[PDB]
Every structure is written in structure tokens, then in C-alpha cells.
RNA sequence: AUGCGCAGAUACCGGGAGGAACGCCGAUGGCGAAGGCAGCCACCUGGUCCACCCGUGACGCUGAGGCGCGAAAGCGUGGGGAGCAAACCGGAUUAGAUACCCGGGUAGUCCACGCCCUAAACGAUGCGCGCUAGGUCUCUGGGUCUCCUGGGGGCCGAAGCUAACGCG
């Protein structure tokens, strides 16, 4: 695995079982708005799962971009 | 849906002695009321042949259950019978 | 009834006594169908990461609540109805999970 | 004329054929170039070297206007894209910011035998 | 008081594919009603084929709504008349008197609903145009305020509301068009309530259609002594003419009218 | 080529409608008799993994026959077609081109209820149990969780099995 950003240690305990976290979970956002990955989060499989799940409850109702124009390129 | 409480209190009213947490008698209460509410889902609904499926597998099973029920003993047997209903 | 938590997004350009007439709506709807608060929340007006409903923020209200189980559907339904319901979100009560600990 | 100092310049690529266009600082916009804009047909116009010539054009047209300072929208990609772009800075006339769009599908309409060979 | 569409009798000989229906308010129609002349001959000189008859009721139905803009009414229930489409709803307006209208969509015995300045946009009730949440279906619906529920989409299911422009609304009409009313005319909202009808299967033409009351036609019928068409012979004519002096079947017929560009615009066509 | 555009298109901006699909995440990953099944939410539901050892008391393994189940194609009526698209129509081709390429466009593709059961239906390998090194990785349930243990997936893999692969 590359190794000189990751984010596991950005926040500690962290509750998955959220959606109204605009900041925690913006830390996954990297440009336009994807899911930084396993490749960042190395959140077991457990993990990149219902991590994910709430992502997803978050673009859901919204307040968070799934994607968006990417301002730089 | 799936009502443990009330599960509990007629695994009771069956299970003849207070010490019956798994028997013959439960097997049936439980496959029998499952079998029951679950199918009348199965009504208002039409298709969900993979649980349908289940659900057949299951009634065989309880049947086979009282299969051997009369095997040694039928006659506490009819008794259940009669005190449910099913196989009339 | 079981418990899940409502959070619903409802139109930003609102004012006084609108907020008033559809929020209490809410109110004895959800009464009606079998809701009762348990938290009355709610963060109050907040902007999006994507212009929906046409804008780019509106009102949020959250309050977690006992309701009928399967009535969720139902009165969703009947809230989503009040046109400026930008979002009708509801979500079964649970809360646990420490990643990172 | 109606001069606006800054707006946006607009490379879409194809590979085939490429185009750029200036626009507005919001979105309409004057005047553009292209592969076959630059006396070219069939395939040439497909070339990073058209690239830098309509680039070219889309420049000394946009001095013509009270414009000249831009950011870059990019959409698609171009054979060629470079030599386009980098022609665009090029001229200058102000090289500024750069948008990325190249707007995404999503998955939901299957697409001719092209890249559908792309299973 | 809805009404079954399929029943179909069987292989009582040829009598066959015999399409039923029935609504069950099956009541008999109420106070409000005369009867037709028997038309087919009229203004004393004879014209257009079939026609023939067969019993006789006939009616008497609101087409106006704005008089009393607001009386709830509850649906006094399902009921119909040897005419129409699709069906009707003899309606009771809360202040005593009732009226027989339309049928929407299957809308329910009993039910309020009524109209005018603002009603609640719930198929059933009615609204000067503007009230329409474009995007939303109604029929019945007038142009021309005043002048009556003018486009009354018989069964036809089809006030299709398509944006609006100055003092006129779009409307998908059934047709496959899309013309113009001034809001402030008016919609009974939602939609029709019959079509299988349109489907129904009936038994040995004679009967039925007849029964129908329409007898015939009979093209280039032979001795073409008149027929337009060719005869006295096998072989379909060539010129491509129709009965009383016609034209084929593939020619204009409006014209300046005024009417026309004035409104609507789609041109008519569709392509099921 | 072509077909579409100065009766202004192709690009850029805004708005409209609808059908389909469902990105990153998401995996060499998961659930299912199979088929095959995914944006989230909620309704009802079924298989199924671990631990206390509490209950019953071997009732269990097998399944000819039947009975329900299910690819995609296609039919039946009633919806619907944004895109894709056999058929068809062109344009490009060779000597020929009905096909491989480009330009078009139906049926169908999609939803409901009904109907066909169809097969490189695959791991080309019936199911049920118990006996015989280990090594490795990965998901998942319990713990004295340098690991151990039950379960679940690919990989290496003694013995051994096969005409040979290769199983292991």
C-alpha cells in the first residue's frame, strides 16, 4: 500500500452511525467530491462499508456534493 | 412481525411443563404460528418464490416433526393436533 | 411503535407564521399517523454542497421519535405532500459504532 | 464588441477534431475555432498541431474583444489536447485559472458498438 | 359502483367475444332528466347513414361549475345515461340539490371534493385553469370562460396541463396536440373514467350494432348509379373519390379560421 | 463517404421533459436451491454465522415419480421507447459483399399480470457424513484476540488419486 497522506488517524473515535458530520466526513472528499478509499481510510472491510453507507445517507439528503466540478485541473 | 413476547408466553401454553425450552411440542407451536402469518404474507404479495421456497422447505420439516411424533407416539400427538388445528 | 429518527429538509424562503402553519402540519400529522417526539431538534437554516430544490440552502428539522413501525412510509408521504419538503428522510433508531478508538 | 476584460475559454476535444471557444464571463460567448475551422478535413483536424492553431485563432480573435483573461473549461479530450492547451497559454493574452468538467456519465445508456466493445 | 370491463360471455354460438360491464350503483338516474327527439332525419330533410335507435332515456348534465364555486359535494354515488363515453357521478351538493357530473378518475362513493377560487388540486374538484399545478391532468375542461366545460374530453382521459404563456395555459389534448386556454376558464380535474370501454368486444354485428342504433354503409356499393366510386362490376375504382361528391380521405379542411394559429400548435398527428 | 447545419449546426450559457442507468465508493469482496441479486430510505421476509449450555429426544441421510422455481431470446393484453438497437434504408467494399466500418431507424430492449423452463445451467464435475501434513492470504462471528477457535472464501500445497493433465 503507498504511504505519505492516509487518514485513519485523522479523527479518532468516530461514530459511523451519523450523517450530520459535514466536517469527519469531508475527510474523505479529496476533488471532485469521490470516496477516498481503502487506499486512504485502510478502514477494514467492516468499514469502507458502513462508512460508507452513511457517505451515502450524507449525499442523500445532501449537504455534500457526491461529486463536482473540480476547480483546478 | 416476529413477536418474541407473546412467542414466549404460547411456546408456554403448549410446552405441557414449564421445562420445555426446546421439544417436539415447540418445534410445532413455532413452525406452525411462522408458517401461518408468514404465508398469509405471501398472499398479499405474489412473488418472492426464493422465500416462498423457504418457507416450503420449513412446513416440510414441522410436518416430518410430527412425523416421528406419531412414529413413537401419536396419540399425545393427536392431542396436539387437536389443540391446533393444521392436518384436519 | 418503534423509534427512528426524522430529519427532513423543508424550503429556505419560508418566514413567520409559514414556519408556523406547516411546521405544526408536521405536528398533528404526525400525531394522526402515531408519531410523538422524543427529541425536538433541529439545526435550524444551512446551505448544501449541490443546488437542490433550485437553491443553494433551506431549513433543516430533526426529531427523533416513537411512531408505528410501518406508518413511517405513510406519513412520509404525507410530508414529502407540503410541496417545499426539499427532503423527507426517515431512519430506523440506532447510534453505535466507535471506528478509530 | 462589448469588452469584458475576463470570461472563459472553452476546450472540448474530440479525436478527430477539436474545439475551443470564447465565452462571456457567465457563458455565451464571441467567437471559436477548430479542427476543420483551421483549414482543415476528415482527420487532421485531429491533431494536436490544428490544436495550436485554432487555439491561435480563439486568441487573436479574443484580443478583438475587450477580453483577453480566462479560465479553461475542459471537456472531453483531445489527440492533442496538449499542444492545443499549451498553444493557448502560449499566446497568452493571459494564460489564468482551469476548470475540469469533461462531464462524467454515471452509467445509464449503453453506448454504440464503439465501446461497447468495452463490455 | 365502479364496473366490470371483460366479462365475456361464452360460446353461447357466435354470440361470442361479448364484452360486459358493470357499474355497481346500478340505481336508476334521478329527477333531473328528459329525453331526445329521435334525430337522424332533421331540420325535416334526412342525412347520415347508420343511425337507427333502440330505447330511450337521455340527459340532462352540469357542464358548469362556478355556480356555487364551492358547495362541497359529496359523491352521491356512480350512475350513468344512454350517452356519454365514460360514465358519470351523480353528485350531491351540500346545500341540497345535486348534480350529475362527469367521473373522473375512479375517484369513491361518498367522497367531498368540489371547486372553484382555490380547491384543493385533488382529481374531483375543479379550478379556473391558472389554480393549475402545470404538469397536473384534468378534461372537461373550457376555453373561452363562461362558455361552458368547453372540451369535454369524453371518456377521453387526456387535459394533459403543459406550461403556460401569457393569459392562456398549454394543453395536451387527446388528439396528440397542444393548444391554449386563458386561465382564468376553467378544469374539471383529474381525468376520464372509461376506456376498456373503448376496448369492449360485442357479439353478431347486426345485433349489436344495431343495438348500438347505427344500421350502415356501403361504399362504391356496387351500382355506383351515385356511390361516387366505381361499380357495375368486381374492381375497386381508381379516380379515389368518396360518397356525396367527395374528396378521398387525405385533404385539408381548415383554413384561414381564424381559429387556428390563434391558439394550438402540434399540428395534428401521433404515433402509437 | 456520409448525413446534418447561414431558414446558424457542430461548441458555450440558461431553462424544459422524460426513459434508462446507477458512478467513486466497491473489492482479486458479499447473500442466494439456482437464476442471479446492488444510489439511499421504509414495509413485510427468508437463508444463514458465532456463544451459555439451558430444551426435546435420534424424529435422521436419500429422493424415482410429482410439485413450485428461474438467464437472455419470443409470445399474450394493457402501459412506456431518452439511449441502445437483428430487422430495413442508406453511405464506404471487393471483382462479391447481404457481414466486419460510418451515417440512419423499427421491433425489441423497460413496467404490470399472464406465457414459454430454454441452455458450454459450469467449478462441463448429485447429494448426505466421517478418516488423512502443513503453509499463505481474505471476510466474518466468540475468546487468556504473539494467537486461538467456529464459519466462509482464492492461493501454495505430502501423502495420494488419473492415460495425462491437474485435483489436492
Redesign the pocket.
Known amino acids: 500500500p503507498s504511504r505519505k497522506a492516509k487518514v485513519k488517524a485523522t479523527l479518532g473515535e468516530f461514530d459511523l452511525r451519523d450523517y450530520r458530520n459535514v466536517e469527519v466526513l469531508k475527510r474523505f472528499l ?1 476533488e ?8 486512504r ?1 485502510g ?7 458502513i ?3 452513511t ?3 450524507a ?2 439528503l445532501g449537504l455534500l456534493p ?2 463536482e466540478k473540480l476547480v483546478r485541473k | ?2 413477536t418474541k413476547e407473546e412467542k414466549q408466553k404460547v411456546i408456554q401454553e403448549f ?1 405441557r ?1 414449564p ?9 410445532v407451536a413455532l413452525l406452525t404460528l ?1 408458517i401461518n ?2 404465508s398469509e ?1 405471501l398472499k398479499v ?14 412446513v ?2 414441522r410436518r ?6 406419531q ?2 407416539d401419536p396419540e399425545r400427538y393427536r392431542a396436539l393436533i387437536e389443540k391446533l388445528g393444521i392436518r384436519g | 411503535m ?1 423509534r ?1 429518527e426524522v430529519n427532513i429538509v423543508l424550503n429556505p424562503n419560508l418566514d413567520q407564521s409559514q414556519l408556523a402553519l406547516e411546521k405544526e402540519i408536521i405536528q398533528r400529522a404526525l400525531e394522526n399517523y402515531g408519531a410523538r417526539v422524543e427529541k425536538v431538534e433541529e439545526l435550524g437554516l444551512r446551505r448544501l454542497a449541490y443546488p437542490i430544490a ?1 437553491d443553494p440552502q433551506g431549513y433543516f428539522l430533526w426529531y427523533q421519535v416513537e411512531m408505528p ?5 405513510d406519513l ?1 408521504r404525507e410530508l414529502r405532500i407540503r410541496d417545499n419538503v426539499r427532503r423527507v ?4 433508531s440506532q447510534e453505535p459504532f466507535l471506528a478509530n478508538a | 464588441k462589448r469588452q469584458v476584460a475576463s470570461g ?1 475559454a ?1 476546450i ?1 476535444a474530440s479525436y478527430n477534431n477539436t ?3 470564447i ?1 462571456d464571463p ?4 464571441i467567437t ?1 475555432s ?1 479542427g476543420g475551422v483551421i483549414g482543415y ?2 482527420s487532421r483536424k485531429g491533431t494536436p498541431y490544428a490544436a495550436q492553431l485554432a487555439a491561435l485563432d480563439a486568441a487573436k480573435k479574443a484580443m478583438a474583444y475587450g477580453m483577453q483573461s480566462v479560465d479553461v ?1 475542459v ?1 472531453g479530450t483531445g489527440a492533442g489536447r496538449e499542444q492545443a492547451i499549451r498553444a493557448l497559454q502560449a499566446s497568452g493574452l493571459q494564460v489564468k485559472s482551469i476548470v475540469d ?1 469533461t462531464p ?11 465501446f ?2 468495452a463490455s | 359502483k365502479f364496473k366490470p370491463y371483460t366479462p365475456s360471455r361464452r360460446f353461447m354460438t357466435v354470440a361470442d367475444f361479448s364484452e360486459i360491464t358493470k357499474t355497481e350503483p346500478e340505481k336508476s338516474l334521478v329527477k333531473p332528466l328528459k329525453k331526445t327527439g329521435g334525430r337522424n332525419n332533421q331540420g325535416r330533410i334526412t342525412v347520415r347513414f347508420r343511425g337507427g335507435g333502440h330505447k330511450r332515456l337521455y340527459r340532462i348534465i352540469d357542464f358548469k361549475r362556478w355556480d356555487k364555486v364551492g358547495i362541497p359535494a359529496k359523491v352521491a354515488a356512480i350512475e350513468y345515461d344512454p350517452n356519454r363515453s365514460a360514465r358519470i357521478a351523480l353528485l350531491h351538493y351540500v346545500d341540497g340539490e345535486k348534480r350529475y357530473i362527469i367521473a373522473p378518475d375512479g375517484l369513491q362513493v361518498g367522497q367531498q371534493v368540489v371547486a372553484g377560487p382555490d380547491a384543493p388540486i385533488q382529481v374531483g374538484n375543479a379550478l379556473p385553469l391558472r389554480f393549475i399545478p ?2 397536473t391532468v384534468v378534461h372537461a375542461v373550457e376555453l373561452e370562460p363562461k362558455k361552458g366545460a368547453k372540451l369535454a374530453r369524453a371518456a377521453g382521459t387526456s387535459a394533459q396541463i403543459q ?1 403556460r404563456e401569457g393569459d392562456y395555459v398549454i394543453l395536451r389534448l387527446p388528439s396528440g396536440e397542444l393548444r391554449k386556454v386563458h386561465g382564468e376558464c376553467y378544469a374539471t380535474v383529474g381525468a376520464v373514467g372509461n ?2 370501454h373503448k ?1 369492449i368486444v360485442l357479439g353478431k354485428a347486426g345485433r349489436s350494432r344495431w343495438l348500438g342504433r347505427r344500421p350502415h354503409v356501403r361504399g362504391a356499393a356496387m351500382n355506383p348509379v351515385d356511390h361516387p366510386h366505381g361499380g357495375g362490376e368486381g374492381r375497386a375504382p381508381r379516380g379515389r373519390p368518396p360518397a356525396s361528391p367527395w374528396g378521398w380521405q387525405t385533404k385539408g379542411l381548415k383554413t384561414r379560421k381564424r381559429r387556428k394559429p390563434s391558439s394550438r400548435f402540434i399540428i395534428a398527428r401521433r ?2
Open positions: 479529496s471532485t467530491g469521490k470516496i477516498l478509499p481503502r487506499r481510510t478502514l477494514s472491510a467492516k468499514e469502507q462499508r462508512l460508507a453507507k457517505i451515502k445517507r449525499r442523500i457526491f461529486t | 412481525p416476529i410446552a411443563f421445562g420445555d425450552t426446546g421439544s417436539t411440542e415447540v418445534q411462522r402469518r408468514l404474507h404479495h405474489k412473488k418472492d418464490h426464493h422465500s416462498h421456497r423457504g418457507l416450503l422447505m420449513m416440510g420439516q416430518r416433526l410430527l412425523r416421528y411424533l412414529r413413537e | 418503534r427512528y433550485k413501525e410501518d406508518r413511517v412510509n412520509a428522510m426517515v431512519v430506523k | 472563459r472553452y472540448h474545439i475551443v471557444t465565452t457567465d457563458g455565451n460567448p471559436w477548430s478535413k476528415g473549461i471537456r468538467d462524467v456519465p454515471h452509467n445509464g445508456c449503453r453506448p454504440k458498438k464503439k461497447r466493445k | 402545470v404538469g406550461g376506456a376498456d376496448n404515433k402509437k
